[PDB]
Curated annotation (Swiss-Prot), chain A:
Domain of life (superkingdom): Bacteria
Family stated for the protein in its record: Belongs to the isocitrate and isopropylmalate dehydrogenases family. LeuB type 1 subfamily.
Protein residues bound to NAD(+): 76-89, 280-292
Organism this protein belongs to: Heyndrickxia coagulans
Protein name, as recorded: 3-isopropylmalate dehydrogenase
Localization: Cytoplasm
PANTHER family cross-referenced by the UniProt entry: 3-ISOPROPYLMALATE DEHYDROGENASE (PTHR42979:SF1)
Cell inner membrane listed as a keyword: no
UniProtKB/Swiss-Prot annotation, chain B:
Cofactor comment: Binds 1 Mg(2+) or Mn(2+) ion per subunit.
Name assigned to this protein: 3-isopropylmalate dehydrogenase
Cross-referenced SMART domains: Iso_dh (SM01329)
Keyword Lipid metabolism found: no
GO molecular function, one term: magnesium ion binding
Site (Important for catalysis): 141, 190
One BP term from GO: L-leucine biosynthetic process
Matches recorded under HAMAP family: LeuB_type1
Enzyme class: oxidoreductase
Residues binding substrate: 96, 106, 134, 222
Catalytic activity: (2R,3S)-3-isopropylmalate + NAD(+) = 4-methyl-2-oxopentanoate + CO2 + NADH
Amino acid sequence: MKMKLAVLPGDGIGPEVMDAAIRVLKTVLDNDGHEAVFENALIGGAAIDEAGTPLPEETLDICRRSDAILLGAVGGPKWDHNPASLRPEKGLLGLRKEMGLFANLRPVKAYATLLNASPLKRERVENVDLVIVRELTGGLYFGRPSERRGPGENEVVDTLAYTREEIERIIEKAFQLAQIRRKKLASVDKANVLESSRMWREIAEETAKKYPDVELSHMLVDSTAMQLIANPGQFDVIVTENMFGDILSDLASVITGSLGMLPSASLRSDRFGMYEPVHGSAPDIAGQGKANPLGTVLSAALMLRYSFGLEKEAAAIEKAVDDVLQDGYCTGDLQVANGKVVSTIELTDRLIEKLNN
Amino acid sequence: MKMKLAVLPGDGIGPEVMDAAIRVLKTVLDNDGHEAVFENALIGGAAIDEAGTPLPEETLDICRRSDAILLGAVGGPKWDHNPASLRPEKGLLGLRKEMGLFANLRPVKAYATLLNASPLKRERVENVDLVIVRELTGGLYFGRPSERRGPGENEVVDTLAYTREEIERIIEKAFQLAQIRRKKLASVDKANVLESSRMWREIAEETAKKYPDVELSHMLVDSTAMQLIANPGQFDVIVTENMFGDILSDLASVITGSLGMLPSASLRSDRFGMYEPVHGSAPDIAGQGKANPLGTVLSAALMLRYSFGLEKEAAAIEKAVDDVLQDGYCTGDLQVANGKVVSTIELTDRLIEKLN
């Protein structure tokens, strides 16, 4: 039904791939019966330009005041020189912690017409359908101390600090995910060495009894890296800590070699989320309409599914996104079968075609 | 020349594979004629049994009086039920630190006759030949504090700590190792976040001065990871901290499907080192004489190169190992050509053969 949306196109191709999103986003809404009022805001370099800050003060309002945020991308050679404090990326990492988003979902499903783009043989990547769930707030990244001690500073340390609550929420969000997917979860840690992974494994084990129909399995971080390349089709949902995830995600993001196609979601406790494609802002290409709207489109379908429980539509989008690709219609970047390269806009249209008849 | 080698076969297919190696050596050291005195030593299950600990004090002595260590594997059903402090595996990590080995090398070279094994496409896995250098004394693995604390003990912590030296030495090695290969050295870290990686990115930059013939690059750990899969054919030598090196190594162990034939070498300061096959002890097939001995034999060739400088005695073996797979011979796990499957020993005979 009625929903409110915060649109932050951003830099580079951001605005192009976001238009595709918005148009197709409406095509299915008023087609199913639901309503929705958008409302833009500046983020990244563009905000730096008309507000002096990549994360403008009023943008946060537009966000807090809305249900979900649809993000494009930030970046560009221009501000590539500004002093850290004031740069595109700072602005993005900012609203991320401002919204308190602690879990990042990475859905990696294979497509029949793109497999030839994968580095893996057809039999290992074909029919892959998983989601990497990475922890975002704790870990070795935020843990203090992180200093050089000396004498002479001939010593240094970094810290991996976690709390029962941070571990228990990312892991729980994980079970709920698998719960509604193929109910198969696999907790990834390094429990045979780190005390942090032992607590994690102890926790994931406790939470296990609060979801009886979900098959929990443990796995060491090093072995999961091999299985992701050897037999990734075995996975459903994977939940791991901050660092291990900032890797499993990436790795998992190439075994299909269908990027600029991958969707990304950042959630938290309730249903508020920020969806954005994986690919960057690709500055040296904006204006040309070469932008692949698909990674941002699929991104939108996710918002519908996780943020508003509107599965039909959610799958409608990705189902459409599948047909269009079969016909041979794509925007150059993808290496579709026979092929039939169109434009960002021409493709957005074909998507609205399937979505209507 | 002369060399004393301690032989620690272990349990399982270990003694079987260690024997292939011995023979090959005893054949090769009679390439340019060198005296090799072998001395066996118990380790793991073998030791538990007739000693009482997976690392007899007598075994350590033998290593100490040795110029190198040849090792099979430990691990056995029969000993996987007793206490973690008296299990086969504890003996290894101990022999590990006890010898002060701080650098782990694990070279991966694709075989034109084993490509069907790889989960990768020819175009990507072929032409692969590289080495991962994993630091072994720092990282979260060995960093204090590391325990649960706080109210209700609901907080945990692990410490990633390193000394200026630990980082310096593991980088010298990788630099000299790169020195004698394609002269390339990719240094992997997390400089954009960890303080440790920053000091590392520096320690490395300085040592770069000392070796201007090498071309030193830098890659964040998470990028190296997808590259090892999207384009691993670009790497020669890569060095990285203890934790990143653990994940990255096993990541390079799958891109070829040659598990049964990956060698390894735990090095340190001088030329003393411990060598072994990357694979485990496969107790399941011990005795059936079907174990693949190549992994352990490449390790022996490795010992020759790094521990004595017989850059050719070693190479002879490597080329030998490559010829026999070229004629279609293999032990079973190998997915060769129309290939002729033969026993652990037969295959061994084929190498001794090629070796002249």
